[model samples]
Target: VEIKLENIVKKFGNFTALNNINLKIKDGEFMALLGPSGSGKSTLLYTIAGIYKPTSGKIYFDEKDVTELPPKDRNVGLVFQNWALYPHMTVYKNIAFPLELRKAPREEIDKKVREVAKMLHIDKLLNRYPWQLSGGQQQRVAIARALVKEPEVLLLDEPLSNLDALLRLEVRAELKRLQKELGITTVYVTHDQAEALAMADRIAVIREGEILQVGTPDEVYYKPKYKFVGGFLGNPPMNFVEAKVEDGKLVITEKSKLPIPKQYVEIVKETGITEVIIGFRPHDAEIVKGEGEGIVGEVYSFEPLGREQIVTVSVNDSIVKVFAPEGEHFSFGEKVTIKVKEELLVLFDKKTEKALEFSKL
Candidate 1:
């Protein structure tokens, strides 16, 4: 099923939770809603599930307007972070509960329960209560419960969050594989950028009740449309430096007068903006000792993590992180240079924080 939300607005008293939100999830597409807490991502998911009614807007399941229908009427499967399996009920009963609600007969309920349980690899746990199962097993039971209904759409609200790091990794891959095999239209809500990037076909980055950008992980990560998106999606995030276009050069400091790339100089003039923000990922830059052909800064902090080291440098009064090869060492207050990959640069208007198109990169 393809899900569509058009002009969706949700308000809680005077506060607006979703502001004229619009999105389309293609059939069998795995879409992720990513943002920080209080960013209205969960609210949007609940709206789609018909758990929260929109103030004014329409929701469609393919071509049918299902805005007024309640969750039970929407044929959608929902799994939350808590799992929320019944403590007293055995796994068999738990997975069978949804079917029992509609009075599915003895044979049908048993067959369907065993089928989904087996698919999730939890058939052995059918005799155990929720408290007797490991967190990972309980999660599987929750998924099996949701899948037993054969829902057209699946909604997962950070279902893997409660697990430990290793378990999370295992379950993350399992979930991804299951989603692809089932080919169910899924909307996953999460604040973890890595999870969103790893699992979704396309990511919807939301902030302040508004959709910022919706694109493939590579597009959002490599070619961010907004400064916030660039900063939000990466580990150590993207570094931003305030530069002034002066004398046909980008002046970061006295020692860092970078010659303007010929392609951008024209756009810089046409925009009539002397001030701009340059963004680049930490991994896109290398840390050089002493003086080099790049921005000059002093090492503020350094952390070695086996494979690589993260060196934080004080550049033009802003802290910027640069990745260093293993076996490299930097002392605090040591002079260093950050040489960013120029072709990978993202330029944004300083005032609006909107990225400017200078050249294809």
Candidate 2:
């Protein structure tokens, strides 16, 4: 189903939840509404399901405007973050409950429920109550319950949130597999950056109820359209340094001057930019042990994260985090330099916080 939300507006009395938001989701496309809590990702999802009537706007499902319809009439399946289920009922009953609401025949419900349960590898737990199943198993049951109805649009509201880290990884793969195999148009809402990065076919980065940027994982991560998106999407997040343009080169201080990235030179020159923020990802720079072409700072914190070390340095009244080689040793007060290639840097407008762009050299 191709879902289109046109000029969507949702309000609660004087408070506005969604502000004239517009988005189009193509059929069989796995779209993720990625944002933090209270950012209106859930409000947008529920509005599409017709749970919360938007203050204004239209919602279309494959050319049919279903904005005023109730959730049940929309043919959409929603699995919430809390895994709402009937505790008194067994797994089989829970999976069959949706079909039972529609007054499905006894035999058809049995076949569909069991089929989805088996597909999700939860057939063995059919006879167990919700409490009897583990967190991961219960989650599978909830998903299987949603899937048994064969909904044209699947709405997942942070479906894997309650599970542990290890189980989250396991179920994440399952979700991608089922969505692809069934070819159902899916709308996933999540605050976990890694989740959106790993699963969604494309990501819509939202902030304060507005869509900031919508693109593939690489586009959002590598070439963020907004400064907030660049800082919010990465694993360790992008480190920012306050800098000023000095003779067309970016300088942090007397000894911390960094040459402007080649791509931004002409743009910086033409715009006559004076103040900016220097942004770069952790892997883009290196923390060296001895003298090199870099900025000097004291070691703030170092965390050994199995594969690599999370290193932070205190520089120029600001903290910068970077990824260091795991085997490197560090002392708390020891000074080190951060070396970044000019090409790896991004410049953000200091006053507006918007990213600045330049044409390819």
Candidate 3:
């Protein structure tokens, strides 16, 4: 199903939970609602599920307006963080509960339950109660229940949050494959950037009751129009530096002046901008021992993680993280020079915190 939310707004008395949200999820597209807690991501999802009626605007399921529809009438399957499976019911009964709610015939309900249970690899555990199954198994059962209804749109709210890290990785792959096989329109809500990037065909970044950016993972990661979008999407997150545009160069500190590359110089010249925020990823920077022709800093910390290490450097009264290759070591108080990839740098308007565009060629 193609889902559209047109100017949807939800309010709780004086507080606005959603502010004029307008989004489109293409038919069979896997769309992720990515945001932190209290960002209204779940509110938007529940609105589509008909759990929270919008204060205004309309919702459409492939051209059919259903803004006023109730939850059961929406025919959208839901899987939440808790899984919420019945403790007493066997896996078969749990999976069959949805069909039974609508009073489907016994034989049809049995067949449907078995079908999705087998698909989710929980067929053998059909006789087990929810408490008897593992965390991953219980999650699969919850998913099986949601799928048995053959919903046109599948809504998942942090379905893997309760699982262990390794199990989350395993289930993430399975969910992606299952979505592809089913070709169901899916709306997934997650605060985890990596999960959204790995699973969704497109991601909608929500913040403070507003849609900040909507695009494929690469687009948001590589070219975020908003500064917060870039900062929010990475693991260590992007390092932000205060820079002042002067003489076709960026001044990080009195001692750190970097010439703007030829291509991006026009961004400052054309806009007549003086001050800007510079954003660069951890991987986009390199640290060299001793003073060099770049930002100079003292190594503050290093965290080794398998194949690579995260080196934190104190620069310009702020911290900058760099992804150093494995086996590299830099002790605290060690002086190092940090240089950023000029072309890959993201410049933002200091006042608005919106990214500046590249000069039109």
Candidate 4:
């Protein structure tokens, strides 16, 4: 089902949880709500799942308004952060519980349970209790239980957060494959940028009870609408430098000044602002050899992880980190030059922190 939220607002006492939120999710699209804790991601999911009613605004399921519908009537399945499986119940019983509650025949429930268990690769643990199964196993069972109902919309609230790092990766892959095969419209909530980027067809980045931007992973990562979105979406995040436009050139500190592309000159002038925040992803900032008009900093430390190394450099008063190819060693206290390319640079307004359009340039 296609889900739509129009000017949705939520509040807890006087504190607003969702501020005039609006979104449209196509049917069968896997959309993820990504943000840090208290960013209102989970709250939005719960509201969509019918666990909580919005203080104002409307929610539509396709063409029908379902904001006032009960959770069961909405035909939505929710998998929570914690497994929430009954400790005393066997895996088979837990998976069967949802169907049984709807009064399915015994034989039909049994058949459906086995089918879902096999699909989720949890058939072997059918007879074990929740405590007896491993974390990953329990997670699969929870997913199977939710899927067994064949709900139109599937909601997941940080479902893989409890697993170990390796297991988290494995489950993420599995979930992606399953969602593609099932073609269910899924709304997932997560704070992990990698998980969202890897799994979501599109991602909604939220902060302080408001969505900063929503788009495909590439759009949100490579072409962000705000400075926070650019900085928050990447693995190592983007670097921020206080800069100004001086004679159609971007002046970084006092030692470096790079010419702004001709296409952006007019827009920069139209904004009538000199001070700006220059942003660039870590990958875009490279360690070059010669001393040019670039930021000069010292390598504070390095972390080697087989395939890649993260070098932390201290530039002026700010510390920045960059990921490089493995075996590219740089000694601590060694002087280095950080070169930023014009194409990769992301410019934002200093006063508002909103990303500025430089596509013309």
Q: Clashing residue pairs in candidate 2, if any? A: none
Query: Model 4: residues >4 Å from true position, as ranges?
Result: 261-263, 324-334, 359-361
Whole-model Cα lDDT of every candidate shown, in order: 0.89, 0.87, 0.89, 0.87
lDDT of 3 by residue, 50-137 (tens): 9899999999998999888886777899887666788899999988887888899999999999999889999999999988999999
Candidate 4 residues 1-361, lDDT tens each? 9999999999999999999999998899999999999999999999999998999999999999999998789999999886579999999999999998899999989999999999999999999999998988998998999988879999999988779999898789899899888899999999999899999999999998899999999999998888889878877888887678888877865655677645567678998889888788888888864457566677888887448888888776677887777867788878888887677887788888988886452
- The TM-scores, one per candidate, come to 0.95, 0.94, 0.95, 0.93
Candidate 2 lDDT score at position 355? 84
Model 2 lDDT per residue over 1-361, tens place: 9999999999898888999898999899999999989999999888988889989999999999898998778888888877677999999999998889899999999999999988889999999998888888888888899888778899999988888998897689788998898899999999999989999999998888888888999999998877888888877888889888988677887767767777888878888889888888988999987544866677989997659998988877899888988888987877788988877888888887778988754
Report, for all candidates in order, the number of backbone clashes: 0, 0, 0, 2
Which candidate gets the maximum lDDT versus the true structure? 1
Backbone clash pairs for candidate 1 read: none
TM-score, cand. 4 vs. native: 0.93
lDDT of 1 at 63: 97
